[PDB]
Each structure stands twice: as structure tokens, then as C-alpha cells.
Subunit: 303 residues, 4 copies
């Protein structure tokens, strides 16, 4: 696929690098508002490519117009979290970015899939889609999903490959582990020595903890989001707990649920969850819709 | 994963080779009735591994008791089709193989996923599961699925990665394209100039044509079935049109539908298809049922 | 790289499949004299590609004029060995193939690297280069090299990645282990309990044993030769004991020594071997020379 | 291989991640003096591994004693460059680190290969080896080597895979392009529209420029150094322009030259360079020896 990267900070570089070395990206165009940053990143990539024999076309640029004719456009441009902040605290800052980008990108990338990475991720995806009128998805709870699998595997001292399942609903701190999907070698997680609250808590806290020590999350979400790109680019049909757009009281919202990710996106698999999980996903919709409306008014308090 | 390969003929060797070089198999045990065959294949694999730096343990054996402790057991032991034959002609001869394997493998590989390759594939899976009571899947129409995708791509002169969709129902000559799933860059196949009947006919005829010219199918189903193994081994959650066990009229039958394939298998997604494709999948259940009951009688009439 | 495959039998198909799934081949054109064979192999490859997201162009053809513009041309067209035969028995029959290919391929593929696989491999490379004057290499003793490594590893019950070293000189039954290059975790092989003669004998006999049981060698040399292709295609600079053209007594001959393989081929490293291994490589030149002159006379005595 | 990482800053993380995802590292132990940093990096890795199905054992730790029984030990612990500094300016700061590590690591990792990454790289490798008495190599001019190939490919608008060759001698700013190795599709670089001084200059300046804009080099040298790890771990025998130890006036020094990198290291290929290149490598030895002796005295001016 041809993939545009809007944002070449820590997470944008990690995602682009990981997606490029995985072989899923035939051509990439990497943009950033910071002078020379994308350009120097391009050189980094070429140097890396030489050792691997990678021939992917890469352009690092400060010119937004170079992001044209892409299949997928990955948006990580935004303020990141500082210790002590919630993700939703960023709404007003980063929504202005999305509003601006929504004016500019569409005419150059008609029919592209837009992949939101910038936080608060689900909200950003809704804002971007509202303004751009372009099909937009959010990395959503796919990162949470993998964090959950890896914690459970570490806890039982089993390979992560023995664990299956997803995290879903609202993003981050408000996500829910979808326990009816969670299986260990095919068996319900109940059959195991697993404290469900300890799993949820690790998932919600570990990014905050990475931020406090390292300064931001990189390798994990970078790899994970790149795999979303790869599933689209190779048409692999991986079920991923991304957030796809839904209509709710005539407003576009984004909420996560296991979703088939291929050259085409969908369907989402919420209808196949157990009752409790389906109730949590309905709930997540109502809560998201309420918090997002509030946030839109508070932004409308521009003047 | 630890993977058992039962049957080391053309397709068995291809699946094993491809699953091993893909990185999805940590240990493999390969069995065949043919004296020394498994041994010499093992030496072939070792030679290949040396150039790749692959360290997977591999044992080729003529003693079936050496296949123990597997996570996945792949069965390709059986007589293949000859130009002229139908897949289902093989039922009696190959059912006898499955009944015997079902009395030997499970005690050594309890709780393994059993992946049926030998034809008639779906019926063999049903027999094996009947005589073993171990969880058994069939390659099903996943091969057809890929043939369909590839045909549409070469026809429209587009990358295969632009095409999404599945083939399902009964296996082989009785399969149906699930047209409500076939999309080109997200758009319904009707918006393109492809003749649905030409697609079907290609899918149905190409294996018979390859069998006529080359003598048997290898690289295609081998790679495609190795990817089923990989999706289980790495818990990738790819939607694949494999055939999983379904309770119908109190019998266990196998029919293909798009199904989540990870360390855990399922759910199948037939409830998300359109009315027409759900009708077709319901008829396939009925038809498979009637034909399997008939075939079972034929088997009794041998023994 | 753009890669031409001349001969789509057992080994040709294996090399091509393995080189294509490794990512080293951007475009491939596969030729065989057998009507429809290349075509049906192409369809096999396309089916495999769909599951992997591989977009390499591939053309199977019965018209040799379709092989043009290649960077590398791989020749496996020829009669194979039967239980009992020696590799060199094939000289006359296969030399006739090479003389013809040499009058047809170069005009269409000027400046390509020609990689000889058909046996007797080294002698075929010398003939092809004689009649084509195009730069021609032979798989040489790279296959032997890997067999030797793998044997030592299984013997000492160590990972194959712990073993380094090469097999060189004449090909096959006349090859010699270059013992000054064989190291286990950096240490000379003498410090371990391996019998040098048992290693040699294994290396010499295993292909004949595989040919006896299975009918021909495939996965091992196929993977190993595909890695020669990859090392050229990605300019990896792997030292491989291939046979490159050497001017001796004003003839061009082919003998194996560890050689740098990248987008450019060479140098060969025989001047860095110990006295004994340099002696052996000098005798192989003399012996190959005398035997090739004899074989050329035999060819004249056919035509 | 089992690989220890001493240092989990920007370059240590990039190298470890790249080496891990490439599949060359079976077990890694990552240490850093910064509290909690390695630990949080380990979590990042596990999260990334979950999406890929990677089962490599990883331990991120603040306890140096955990770095035991490794095959390879990769040392990136040290002060990095700030704009305006040369690499050799760091000698006195980072040599103290190496002296300390030389007391501590050996008894826990007997017979390991130590891979120096921290600057001034060649000097650091000599210091570490002097004090530890352990076999030590330096990433050397391998990074420069790839930078050169990629620049030339960009300049001629050809794939980097068409370019072959190496940079060698002293490190960084004092490196020399070894023009007799440099080939484009097999042809001498003279046959091409290439300004040699412009190539050298780009190579020497581009890291300084990345540092000024981004803050440090990451992806390129990370990938490149990881490929050195991979060549050792898979015993691939890639020729790489690393710096291996040589004796000079009874002192151990490190200088770069194309070197065969496998489970065993060596031989270096300086003897096969043209005259001019060989003279530059002799020269580099004399100059290195002089600057390193000076630096050792200036450090001995501890008191
Ligand atoms: N799982 C996830 O979804 C996930 C993971 C990691 C980070 N993030 C989020 O991604 C965003 C970026 O994080 P980061 O660590 O890379 O931050 P960072 O500060 O390293 O980078 C942000 C980048 O965005 C750029 N930027 C800001 N405004 C821009 C504009 N108008 N146009 C173009 N570029 C612009 C900056 O120049 C900078 O290079 C943050 O919102 C962070 O919270 C999300
Ligand atoms: N897409 C698919 O599902 C697919 C693709 C290719 C082949 N097949 C089927 O796979 C089967 C094998 O095809 P093939 O081309 O490899 O045939 P083959 O003759 O090359 O190999 C069959 C192997 O099974 C062995 N065998 C027979 N009975 C056995 C037993 N009781 N235990 C162990 N091994 C036994 C034979 O010894 C032989 O080595 C056939 O039924 C064929 O129709 C299915
Ligand atoms: N390590 C090695 O170097 C190695 C390994 C395996 C096989 N081989 C050699 O490779 C050759 C092929 O072995 P195989 O097992 O694939 O034999 P095979 O009979 O399976 O295949 C040979 C193919 O070459 C074709 N052929 C014959 N003449 C031709 C021509 N003029 N143009 C195009 N195609 C032509 C045949 O039609 C057939 O499809 C043999 O000489 C064998 O000894 C070498
Ligand atoms: N091609 C190359 O060889 C290459 C490429 C990039 C960077 N580097 C060099 O590598 C070194 C590290 O660079 P970076 O960008 O990762 O710097 P950085 O500041 O991001 O990280 C340096 C790390 O070393 C750690 N450290 C310092 N002293 C230590 C000790 N005594 N024990 C353990 N850990 C210690 C720090 O805690 C820090 O995390 C520098 O010398 C830099 O110049 C070399």
C-alpha cells in the first residue's frame, strides 16, 4: 500500500518504521510541521533500508501537499500526554489540528482510509471524520487488547500465543476487557488462576507508567498500529479491536469492538459477544456520545 | 507451536516446509507409513534450515508413537485425486485411514487442534472427529477463497491485496462464492466488470487443470494451509473460510464459513452475511448432511 | 530483482517458490518446454501469493522470448540423476541444453547473472559461459556446505547457528570440506569429538539417499539456492561456497570456494585458507580442467 | 542467540527491538543504570510481541548481574554527542564506563562476543578489550558503509540493492570510502556519474545533521547494528565493515575493514583490497594507534 504519515514524532516514526520493515508499505510519504524532522527521518530510513535490501519509496517532507494519492493516511500529529493528564484532556488542543487537517488532506487523497492515532484517539477520529467527511478509523482498544494478552501470558508463565481475546468500548482508562472473548488455549479464562481486576488495572495503568519513566509509549503501540496497517495492506482479515464509525443520534462516534480488518473494513463483531459484553458496548456508546458532545461545546467556546 | 504432520507426501511436505520457514512451527514431528520417507525429508529440512538459521526441532519418523504432545496435528495422509475423479470418490478409502488415526493420535496428543487436509476434506474432518472426539477443523474453502481473490485481481489487473472476500459452503465443486463479502478496495464487486460465473468456474476448475498438467496441487494449498497453521500458532485472529465442526440434526458436520482463527477457533461469521449468502450456507448444511449420511452407509458396506 | 527461471521441474519450482516467498524476487518469468506446465505453476504461485499479500509479477510461459530484461537467470533445465548415476554422466545430454539456451537467452537478458543449477553443475556453468560469454555462476558446493553444517550440529546436539564453515573444490562426490574454515562457536573443529571422515561421507551420500527414497532432492537445495538469489538481490554480501568463473590455462572453469555474494560477485577467498585447504583447491582446478577437456571431446563426439 | 544489552537509551532500544523482531534473538537481557527504564522497555517489547506472536524471552532489568550466560553482549551505555562535538571528545567520559563494565561483565558471560556501540566506538572497543581481556568488536564503519550505498543509490535514482561496497579505516569523520569495493551492478563506480568527494562528505556529515535536528541517530544505525547481531546469530557470513581487534606495537586497536561475520568472526579482507585502499588501511592503523595512546595518557591524567 501507499501510506501517508501525518506526524513524525516518536509514535509516527515507530509506526512508519515498523510498517516499512514489515514490508506492508510500498511507498510512504512522511510529513511533520517541525522543520527538517521528516527529512532527517527519511535519511534514517534509507540507511536502514540499505542493510535489509528494502526498496520501498520513501519521502520525508515538510510539504503537506506531498501527501497525495495515498491508500491509507495515518494521523499521529498532536500533543501527547504528560504525567498526570488523562487522554481526554488533550481534546481541545488536538481537535483544532484535526479540523485543520480535515480541510487540507481530502482533496489530495480521495477515497483513502484515515487511521487516527493522536489522542484522545476515538474522539479525534470522530472530529476528523465529521469535518473531513472521509472514512476514518481509530487504533482504539487494539493496543489495550495486546497489553491484556501479554499480561495474562506473563502472569501464567505461558507463551502470549496461548492467549486470545479483546479489550473494547471507550478508549484507554474507560475501556473494558471483553471477558467472553478471552481464552487460554481455547478455554474460558474462569478456568484459570486469573484475577480479572488485576488484568484491567495493569492495562489501564501501564501506559501512564511508561510515560512517567520513558516520556511516551513507542514500541508497543507502534508495532501494534503498524500491524493494523499491515492487515489492511495485505488484506489479511485480522480481527482487531479498532474503533470504527457508528451513527448515534445522527452524530458519528467511534467505539472499539473486534472488527474484521482487510482491504475492506468490517464487519464489527459486537453482535456475537455474550450479553454482559454487549451491554458494556451499548453503554460505552451512550457514555462516549455524552462526553464527546460536551467536549464539542467546550471547543465551541472558542467564541 | 508444536506441530504434528501425518502424511509426508506432496502436499504434506509442502505444508510442513512452508509452515516451518514461516516461523510458526517451533517443533515438528513428521510421520508417514512409507519407510524412510520421513527420515529423508527431515534431512532435507535440516539442510534448508542451516542457510536460514532456523533452529526448530524436527523429527521425521516411521513410528506414530513419536507424535506426542502436539499443539496442532495436520493430517494429509490419504489417496489423492486423479484426473477424472471427484473429491468425494475418495471417501471410503480415506475414511479408513481417518478411523485408524483417530484410535492412535489422540492418546498421544490430547486436546490438540486437528487440521484436516486429506480429501474429501470436510467429510474427512467429520469422520475423524466422529472416531476421535477431538476438536477437528478442515482446510475447507480457504484454498478456494484465495483462488477467487487471485482470479479477480489478475482479471482487473490490480494487486491481489485490493481484493477481499470469501468462498464458503460445501467444499470444492460444490462451493459458493460468498458475494456479499467480495469487495475491491472496499467497494462491492457489482461496481466492477467481473463476471461472477466466470469467477466460480475458474475456482472450480483450476485444481483439476493443475492436477491434469502437473499431477497434483502443491504450492498454492500448501501455502494457504500453512497460513491457517500460522494464524493459530501466532494467535493472529485472521478470518478464514475454514470448516469448523457444527452440530446439525444431532450430527457433527463440517461446512465452510468465514471464521476467526486464533489460538482459539471461532466464532464463525455466517450470521453477518446477507440473506442470499446465508441461504446458500444453510443449503450446504442440508446437502452435506444428506451426502455424509449416504457416505457413512457406504463405509459400513465396506467393513 | 527480476528473475528468470529456466526449467520448472521439481527443483526449479522449489527455487522459484522459495525465492519469491523470501521477498527477493520482484518479478519472475518462468519457462519450461513442457506445454502448460509453466502456466499452471504460475496459477499455483498466484494462489499462494493471495494469502501472503505478495504482489510480485509472475508469468509462466512456453515462449522463451518472454524471458527478457532479467537481472538474474536461473537455469535448472536438464535431466536429473537416477539412483546409480553419477552427476557427470549427464554432461553430454545437458550440455546440449546449455548450448541452445546460450544462443537464445543472452540477446534478451544482456548482462544478467546466470545461475547454474542443472547438473553436472560446475561443468554446465563452464559450458554455458563458453557458449554465451555471459557471466555465469554455479550453485557449486553451497548445498554441500549447508549439509556439512547441519550434520555437525545434529551430531553434537547443538543449534546449526553454532556451526560455521565451508565445503569447496569440485562439486558433489569430489568436494572437500575446507576444515580450516569449520568452527563451532568460534573454536576449531578439532577441539570437538567429530569424525571428519564421517562428515565427508554424510555430505557425499545424503543426496543419493534422498534420491533413492523420495526420487530427487528439493527443499534443501531449493532453499539454499534461493538464498544465493536473495543474497545477490538484496546485496547482502554473504560468503557462500558457490563456483565462480576462473581463468585457468586459458580456459574458463568453475570450482567452488567461499566467495562474497552481493549485487556484485566476488572476491573469492581461497587466498585466506590454510595451506592444506589451498592445496586442495589447487588440485580441484587441475582435476576439473582435465575432466572438462575430456568431457568437451565427448560432446564433440556426439554432435 | 542469547543477547545482552548494556544500555537502553535510544540506540540500545532501537537495536534490541530491531534484533528481536528480526528473529535473531531467542533471549535478551536488557540492562540500564537509569531506574525503571529497562523494565518499562520490557513491557513495551511484550506488548509488541503479542501482535507478532513473538515468544522470545525478554528481561528488562536494573540488576547488572542478570546479564549472564549471554552469547553476545552489546554495549551502548555512554554519553552521546551534542551538536558541535566530535565523537572522540567523549573518550574520557565513556572510557571510565568501559573500565567499570570490564571489571563486572566477564565473569558472568565467559567466552561472549562483545559488540561495542558506544562512542568513540573503535576506541571504546579497544579500551574495553584491554581491560576485560574479552574478544570485542566494534560496529565500526558498517553504518558509514550503508550510508554510502544509500546515497549513491539516491543520487543515481537506482535501487540501493544495485550498489555494493564498503567504508573502512578509522571511525566516522576519519573513515575512508574503499573505492575499490564500490560497484554499481557489478561495474566500477568510475563508469558512473558519481562525485566521490560529495559521497564522502555526505557520509561524514549526515549523522551530525540528524543529531542537530532530531537529537540523535536511531533507526539507521539501530537496524544496521542489529543486522551485525543477526549475521552472528544466524551464522550468515555477511561481509561487514566492522572493526575487529588487531595488535599494533603490542597494543590492541580496532580499525574497520570488510570482515566475514558469522558464528565465528573473520577473516578480515584487507589483503584483497587494491593498493590505494590497503595503504589507507595501514595509514588508519598508524593514526588510530597515535590518537588512542594520546587519549589513554589524557585519561591517565586522572592522577
Ligand atoms: N495508542 C495510541 O493511540 C497512541 C500511542 C502513542 C502515542 N499516541 C498519541 O499520538 C500523539 C503523538 O504522540 P508522540 O509521542 O509521537 O508525540 P511527539 O511530541 O513525539 O510528536 C508529536 C508530533 O506531532 C507533530 N505535530 C504537532 N502538531 C502538528 C500539525 N498541526 N501538523 C503536523 N505535525 C504536527 C509535532 O511536530 C511532533 O513531531 C499524541 O496525541 C499521543 O498521545 C497514541
Ligand atoms: N486443499 C486441500 O485440502 C488439498 C490440497 C492438496 C491435496 N489434498 C489431499 O491431500 C491428500 C494427500 O495428497 P498428496 O498429493 O500429498 O498425496 P501423496 O500420495 O503425494 O501423499 C499421501 C501420503 O500419505 C501417506 N499415507 C497413506 N496412508 C497413510 C497413513 N495411514 N498414515 C500416514 N501416512 C499415510 C502416503 O504414504 C503418502 O506419502 C489427498 O487426499 C489429496 O486429495 C488436499
Ligand atoms: N544442488 C543442485 O545444484 C541441484 C539440486 C537439485 C537438482 N539439480 C539438477 O537440476 C536439474 C533439474 O532437476 P529436477 O529435479 O528439477 O528435474 P525435473 O525433471 O523435475 O525438471 C527438469 C525440467 O527441465 C525441463 N527441461 C528440459 N529441457 C529443457 C529446455 N531446453 N528448456 C527449458 N526446460 C527444459 C523439463 O521439461 C523439466 O520440467 C537436474 O540436472 C538435476 O541434477 C541440481
Ligand atoms: N553507529 C554507532 O556506533 C552509534 C549510533 C548511535 C549512537 N551511538 C552512541 O551510543 C551511545 C548511546 O547513545 P544513545 O543515543 O542511546 O544515548 P542516550 O543518552 O539515549 O542513552 C545512553 C544510555 O546509556 C546509559 N548509561 C550511561 N552510563 C551508563 C552505565 N555506566 N551503565 C549502564 N547504562 C549507562 C544511560 O542511562 C542511557 O539510557 C553514545 O555514545 C552514542 O554516541 C553510536
Amino acid at each position: 500500500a501507499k501510506v501517508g504519515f501525518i506526524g513524525a514524532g516518536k509514535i509516527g516514526q515507530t509506526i512508519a518504521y515498523s510498517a516499512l520493515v514489515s514490508g506492508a508499505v510500498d511507498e510512504a510519504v512522511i510529513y511533520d510541521i517541525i522543520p527538517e524532522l521528516p527529512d532527517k527521518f527519511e535519511h534514517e530510513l534509507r540507511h536502514a533500508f540499505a542493510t535489509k535490501g528494502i526498496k520501498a519509496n520513501v519521502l520525508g517532507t515538510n510539504s503537506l501537499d506531498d501527501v497525495s494519492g495515498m491508500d491509507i493516511v495515518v494521523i499521529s500529529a498532536g500533543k501527547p500526554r504528560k504525567p498526570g493528564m488523562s487522554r481526554r484532556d488533550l481534546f481541545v488542543d488536538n481537535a483544532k489540528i484535526m479540523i485543520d487537517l480535515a480541510q487540507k488532506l481530502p482533496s489530495k487523497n480521495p477515497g483513502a482510509i484515515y487511521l487516527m492515532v493522536a489522542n484522545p484517539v476515538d474522539m479525534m477520529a470522530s472530529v476528523f471524520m465529521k469535518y473531513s467527511k472521509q472514512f476514518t478509523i481509530s487504533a482504539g482498544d487494539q493496543v489495550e487488547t495486546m497489553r491484556m494478552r501479554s499480561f495474562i501470558a506473563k502472569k501464567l508463565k505461558i507463551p502470549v500465543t496461548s492467549v486470545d481475546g479483546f479489550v473494547g468500548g471507550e478508549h484507554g482508562e474507560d475501556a473494558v476487557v471483553l471477558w467472553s472473548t478471552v481464552k487460554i488455549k481455547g478455554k474460558p479464562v474462569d478456568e484459570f488462576n486469573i484475577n480479572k481486576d488485576e488484568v484491567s488495572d495493569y492495562v489501564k495503568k501501564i501506559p501512564g507508567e511508561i510515560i512517567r519513566v520513558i516520556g511516551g509509549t513507542t514500541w508497543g503501540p507502534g508495532t501494534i498500529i503498524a500491524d493494523i496497517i499491515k492487515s489492511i495492506a495485505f488484506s489479511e482479515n485480522r480481527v482487531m479491536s479498532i474503533a470504527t464509525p457508528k451513527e448515534y443520534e445522527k452524530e458519528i462516534i467511534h467505539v472499539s469492538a473486534p472488527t474484521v480488518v482487510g482491504s475492506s473494513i468490517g464487519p464489527s463483531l459486537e453482535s456475537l459477544l455474550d450479553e454482559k459484553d454487549r451491554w458494556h458496548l451499548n453503554s460505552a456508546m451512550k457514555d462516549f456520545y455524552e462526553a464527546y458532545k460536551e467536549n464539542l461545546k467546550q471547543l465551541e467556546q472558542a467564541t
